[PDB]
Design an enzyme around this catalytic site. Structure first.
Site, PDB file in Angstrom:
ATOM      1  N   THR A  27     -25.312   6.919  24.102  1.00  0.00           N
ATOM      2  CA  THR A  27     -25.152   7.258  25.502  1.00  0.00           C
ATOM      3  C   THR A  27     -24.119   8.362  25.657  1.00  0.00           C
ATOM      4  OG1 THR A  27     -25.855   5.138  26.392  1.00  0.00           O
ATOM      5  CG2 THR A  27     -24.213   6.324  27.672  1.00  0.00           C
ATOM      6  N   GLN A 100     -34.999   5.122  23.433  1.00  0.00           N
ATOM      7  CA  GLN A 100     -34.485   3.770  23.538  1.00  0.00           C
ATOM      8  C   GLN A 100     -34.607   3.318  24.999  1.00  0.00           C
ATOM      9  OE1 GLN A 100     -30.299   2.536  23.471  1.00  0.00           O
ATOM     10  NE2 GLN A 100     -30.815   1.189  21.733  1.00  0.00           N
ATOM     11  N   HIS A 174     -34.323  -1.633  23.861  1.00  0.00           N
ATOM     12  CA  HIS A 174     -32.904  -1.991  23.797  1.00  0.00           C
ATOM     13  C   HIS A 174     -32.693  -3.482  24.073  1.00  0.00           C
ATOM     14  CE1 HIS A 174     -28.727  -1.879  23.441  1.00  0.00           C
ATOM     15  NE2 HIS A 174     -28.425  -0.802  24.147  1.00  0.00           N
ATOM     16  N   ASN A 177     -26.508  -5.416  22.536  1.00  0.00           N
ATOM     17  CA  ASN A 177     -25.245  -5.068  23.177  1.00  0.00           C
ATOM     18  C   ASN A 177     -25.071  -5.585  24.592  1.00  0.00           C
ATOM     19  OD1 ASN A 177     -24.489  -3.663  20.775  1.00  0.00           O
ATOM     20  ND2 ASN A 177     -25.326  -1.742  21.593  1.00  0.00           N
ATOM     21  N   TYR A 179     -27.045  -6.095  27.092  1.00  0.00           N
ATOM     22  CA  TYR A 179     -27.853  -5.606  28.198  1.00  0.00           C
ATOM     23  C   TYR A 179     -28.996  -6.585  28.525  1.00  0.00           C
ATOM     24  CZ  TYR A 179     -24.754  -1.650  27.670  1.00  0.00           C
ATOM     25  OH  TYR A 179     -23.641  -0.839  27.586  1.00  0.00           O
ATOM     26  N   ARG A 226     -33.966  -3.167  18.962  1.00  0.00           N
ATOM     27  CA  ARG A 226     -32.560  -3.349  18.618  1.00  0.00           C
ATOM     28  C   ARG A 226     -32.070  -4.695  19.098  1.00  0.00           C
ATOM     29  NH1 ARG A 226     -27.203   0.654  18.760  1.00  0.00           N
ATOM     30  NH2 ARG A 226     -27.197   0.792  16.482  1.00  0.00           N
ATOM     31  N   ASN A 234     -19.646  -7.085  26.295  1.00  0.00           N
ATOM     32  CA  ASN A 234     -19.898  -7.721  27.586  1.00  0.00           C
ATOM     33  C   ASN A 234     -20.646  -9.026  27.438  1.00  0.00           C
ATOM     34  OD1 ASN A 234     -18.715  -5.693  29.321  1.00  0.00           O
ATOM     35  ND2 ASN A 234     -20.477  -4.429  28.757  1.00  0.00           N
ATOM     36  N   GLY A 316     -24.004   6.787  13.895  1.00  0.00           N
ATOM     37  CA  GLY A 316     -23.697   7.110  15.278  1.00  0.00           C
ATOM     38  C   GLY A 316     -22.575   8.127  15.427  1.00  0.00           C
ATOM     39  N   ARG A 317     -21.339   7.637  15.417  1.00  0.00           N
ATOM     40  CA  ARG A 317     -20.186   8.486  15.674  1.00  0.00           C
ATOM     41  C   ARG A 317     -20.128   9.723  14.748  1.00  0.00           C
ATOM     42  NH1 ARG A 317     -16.390   3.263  16.215  1.00  0.00           N
ATOM     43  NH2 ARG A 317     -18.098   2.570  14.841  1.00  0.00           N
TER      44      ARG A 317
HETATM   45  C1  LIG Z   1     -20.270   6.828  22.605  1.00  0.00           C
HETATM   46  C2  LIG Z   1     -21.227   5.769  22.132  1.00  0.00           C
HETATM   47  C3  LIG Z   1     -22.409   5.547  22.830  1.00  0.00           C
HETATM   48  C4  LIG Z   1     -23.301   4.576  22.396  1.00  0.00           C
HETATM   49  N1  LIG Z   1     -24.469   4.378  23.112  1.00  0.00           N
HETATM   50  C5  LIG Z   1     -25.407   3.498  22.629  1.00  0.00           C
HETATM   51  C6  LIG Z   1     -26.643   3.404  23.264  1.00  0.00           C
HETATM   52  O1  LIG Z   1     -26.971   4.165  24.198  1.00  0.00           O
HETATM   53  N2  LIG Z   1     -27.548   2.456  22.812  1.00  0.00           N
HETATM   54  C7  LIG Z   1     -27.230   1.633  21.753  1.00  0.00           C
HETATM   55  O2  LIG Z   1     -27.992   0.706  21.425  1.00  0.00           O
HETATM   56  N3  LIG Z   1     -26.000   1.732  21.130  1.00  0.00           N
HETATM   57  C8  LIG Z   1     -25.083   2.664  21.554  1.00  0.00           C
HETATM   58  N4  LIG Z   1     -23.919   2.843  20.828  1.00  0.00           N
HETATM   59  C9  LIG Z   1     -23.747   2.096  19.546  1.00  0.00           C
HETATM   60  C10 LIG Z   1     -24.190   3.003  18.382  1.00  0.00           C
HETATM   61  O3  LIG Z   1     -25.609   3.176  18.413  1.00  0.00           O
HETATM   62  C11 LIG Z   1     -23.794   2.417  17.029  1.00  0.00           C
HETATM   63  O4  LIG Z   1     -24.357   1.119  16.917  1.00  0.00           O
HETATM   64  C12 LIG Z   1     -22.284   2.366  16.843  1.00  0.00           C
HETATM   65  O5  LIG Z   1     -21.693   3.587  17.252  1.00  0.00           O
HETATM   66  C13 LIG Z   1     -21.931   2.041  15.395  1.00  0.00           C
HETATM   67  O6  LIG Z   1     -22.389   3.015  14.488  1.00  0.00           O
HETATM   68  P1  LIG Z   1     -21.392   4.133  13.879  1.00  0.00           P
HETATM   69  O7  LIG Z   1     -20.239   3.383  13.226  1.00  0.00           O
HETATM   70  O8  LIG Z   1     -22.183   4.901  12.842  1.00  0.00           O
HETATM   71  O9  LIG Z   1     -20.926   4.999  15.020  1.00  0.00           O
HETATM   72  C14 LIG Z   1     -23.016   3.814  21.261  1.00  0.00           C
HETATM   73  C15 LIG Z   1     -21.825   4.026  20.582  1.00  0.00           C
HETATM   74  C16 LIG Z   1     -20.938   5.005  21.004  1.00  0.00           C
HETATM   75  C17 LIG Z   1     -19.693   5.219  20.205  1.00  0.00           C
HETATM   76  C1  LIG Z   2     -21.915   3.199  26.004  1.00  0.00           C
HETATM   77  C2  LIG Z   2     -22.922   2.290  25.372  1.00  0.00           C
HETATM   78  C3  LIG Z   2     -24.187   2.221  25.900  1.00  0.00           C
HETATM   79  C4  LIG Z   2     -25.121   1.392  25.311  1.00  0.00           C
HETATM   80  C5  LIG Z   2     -24.782   0.638  24.201  1.00  0.00           C
HETATM   81  O1  LIG Z   2     -25.741  -0.201  23.650  1.00  0.00           O
HETATM   82  C6  LIG Z   2     -23.509   0.695  23.671  1.00  0.00           C
HETATM   83  C7  LIG Z   2     -22.571   1.542  24.255  1.00  0.00           C
HETATM   84  C1  LIG Z   3     -19.862   8.315  26.994  1.00  0.00           C
HETATM   85  C2  LIG Z   3     -19.713   7.475  28.219  1.00  0.00           C
HETATM   86  C3  LIG Z   3     -19.020   7.952  29.321  1.00  0.00           C
HETATM   87  C4  LIG Z   3     -18.889   7.170  30.460  1.00  0.00           C
HETATM   88  C5  LIG Z   3     -19.447   5.898  30.494  1.00  0.00           C
HETATM   89  O1  LIG Z   3     -19.321   5.114  31.627  1.00  0.00           O
HETATM   90  C6  LIG Z   3     -20.143   5.423  29.391  1.00  0.00           C
HETATM   91  C7  LIG Z   3     -20.275   6.211  28.255  1.00  0.00           C
HETATM   92  C1  LIG Z   4     -18.386   1.537  23.486  1.00  0.00           C
HETATM   93  C2  LIG Z   4     -17.529   2.476  22.700  1.00  0.00           C
HETATM   94  C3  LIG Z   4     -17.283   3.750  23.192  1.00  0.00           C
HETATM   95  C4  LIG Z   4     -16.488   4.630  22.477  1.00  0.00           C
HETATM   96  C5  LIG Z   4     -15.958   4.221  21.257  1.00  0.00           C
HETATM   97  O1  LIG Z   4     -15.171   5.084  20.535  1.00  0.00           O
HETATM   98  C6  LIG Z   4     -16.209   2.959  20.758  1.00  0.00           C
HETATM   99  C7  LIG Z   4     -16.995   2.069  21.484  1.00  0.00           C
END
Ligand SMILES: Cc1cc2nc3c(=O)[nH]c(=O)nc-3n(C[C@H](O)[C@H](O)[C@H](O)COP(=O)(O)O)c2cc1C
Ligand SMILES: Cc1ccc(O)cc1
Ligand SMILES: Cc1ccc(O)cc1
Ligand SMILES: Cc1ccc(O)cc1
Ligand SMILES: Cc1ccc(O)cc1
Ligand SMILES: Cc1ccc(O)cc1
Ligand SMILES: Cc1ccc(O)cc1
Length: 347
Positions: A27, A100, A174, A177, A179, A226, A234, A316-317
């Site tokens: 996201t 997703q 999705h 997490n 949702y 997922r 949450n 991800g990150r």
């Molecule tokens: C900024 C951010 C946004 C994310 N948005 C989503 C998302 O939209 N849908 C989802 O299922 N997980 C979301 N995640 C979780 C990631 O898909 C992933 O599971 C998590 O970052 C761990 O992987 P990593 O250590 O390689 O970053 C998000 C994580 C971060 C940090």
């Molecule tokens: C910001 C975010 C959105 C979805 C998600 O599954 C995790 C983190």
């Molecule tokens: C990356 C992001 C920014 C705002 C927010 O509410 C969620 C996710």
């Molecule tokens: C949900 C989230 C957003 C940013 C982050 O760095 C870690 C977790």
């Protein structure tokens, strides 16, 4: 050496991935205010097309799904057209991409959809307010009726049909997490006493209805899911949740999905109720393609895959910090570390 990350991986008869690396769903809150994907998003995804498969940012199925600003949708024609620009650009670069599909359930906020009802399995409010927003305090959800549920399944299915016109290769549902779908699967959020609550079968019903409705539109080969068998996003933990997943996972195997994907942030963490790490729990209860994720380096992912812990790795990150992640790993080059400051820029 991480050579096995560059193995071709046949998901199924419809889709073969050029490597084992997925871009995790992330996201970014950078869509236009009508939730249409922007040309900057087109560029962002296109430059990551060396991934074997991109999972898009969570994409909402209808207005009352929205819990964060400027998250893209896939329920209007304009949104579909915007996504088609994204998927065309990814494909033109030799990539593949799944959308997703999201509904945030009790984590939605009425500020985003004109003050309407927040929907969830039960009237159980989460603590706090929307991140990075001014005083959008979460509200008590309305417990969905069976008619609401039928409409939600319908709308997941419609969104999945829209994915065809939008040109995606498939959908990741999705279910993770905390949702909407995950809310049915956990006791904290699901306190229902009808056929959608109480027992593992009942609590799994909504998830399986959504999976089956989406398969009916786009096929099992184009449908992934997922899941978060643990809590802590949450979601308060409950020692009874594990038996829900013990039931759900073999039921999912019957559907022969493209993949199941774990939704966690650090897979090195051992969860008490799962008897270990999330991936090891799922691997023990599910015998088809599995996507691992959560604080993996290319090196540790490669070793995990070599050890049969899972089949594909979502990143991800590091993919935010390194648009050229795949090439850098391929060339054994230094990766930039991720920091949250990077979220302000869509590159
Ligand atoms: C900024 C951010 C946004 C994310 N948005 C989503 C998302 O939209 N849908 C989802 O299922 N997980 C979301 N995640 C979780 C990631 O898909 C992933 O599971 C998590 O970052 C761990 O992987 P990593 O250590 O390689 O970053 C998000 C994580 C971060 C940090
Ligand atoms: C910001 C975010 C959105 C979805 C998600 O599954 C995790 C983190
Ligand atoms: C990356 C992001 C920014 C705002 C927010 O509410 C969620 C996710
Ligand atoms: C949900 C989230 C957003 C940013 C982050 O760095 C870690 C977790
Ligand atoms: C009409 C109806 C159907 C199912 C149910 O659980 C309640 C009422
Ligand atoms: C999601 C999808 C994409 C192409 C197709 O031919 C069918 C379904
Ligand atoms: C023919 C076909 C193949 C795959 C799929 O998901 C849908 C239709």
């Amino acid at each position: 050496s991480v050579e096995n990350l560059f193995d071709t991986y046949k998901l199924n008869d419809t889709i073969t991935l050029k490597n084992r690396i997925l871009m995790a769903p992330l996201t970014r809150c950078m869509a236009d205010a009508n939730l249409v994907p922007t040309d900057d998003m087109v560029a962002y995804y296109a430059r990551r097309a060396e991934a074997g498969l991109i999972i898009s940012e969570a994409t909402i199925i209808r207005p009352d799904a929205q819990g964060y600003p400027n998250t893209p949708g896939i329920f209007t024609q304009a949104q579909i057209a915007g996504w088609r620009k994204v998927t065309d650009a990814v494909h033109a670069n030799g990539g593949k991409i799944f959308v997703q599909l999201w509904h945030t359930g009790r984590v939605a906020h009425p500020h985003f959809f004109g003050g309407g009802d927040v929907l969830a399995p039960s009237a159980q409010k989460i603590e706090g307010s929307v991140p990075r927003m001014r005083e959008l305090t979460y509200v008590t959800p309305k417990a969905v009726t069976v008619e609401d549920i039928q409409g939600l399944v319908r709308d997941y299915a419609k969104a999945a049909e829209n994915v065809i016109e939008a040109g995606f290769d498939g959908v990741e549902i999705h279910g993770a997490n905390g949702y909407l779908i995950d809310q049915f699967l956990h006791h904290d959020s699901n306190r229902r006493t009808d056929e959608y609550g109480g027992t593992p079968v009942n609590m799994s019903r909504f998830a399986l209805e959504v999976v089956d409705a989406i398969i009916a539109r786009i096929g099992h080969d184009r449908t992934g899911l997922r899941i978060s068998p643990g809590a802590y996003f949450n979601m308060a933990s409950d020692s009874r949740d594990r038996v829900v997943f013990d039931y759900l996972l073999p039921e999912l195997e019957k559907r022969d999905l493209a993949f199941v994907h774990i939704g966690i942030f650090d897979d090195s963490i051992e969860f008490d109720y799962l008897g270990g790490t999330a991936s090891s729990y799922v691997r023990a209860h599910y015998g088809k393609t599995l996507v691992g994720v959560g604080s993996y380096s290319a090196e540790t992912a490669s070793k995990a895959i070599a050890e049969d812990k899972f089949d594909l790795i979502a990143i991800g990150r590091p993919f935010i910090a390194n648009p050229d992640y795949v090439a850098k790993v391929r060339n054994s080059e230094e990766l930039v570390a991720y920091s949250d400051e990077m979220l302000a820029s869509l590159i």
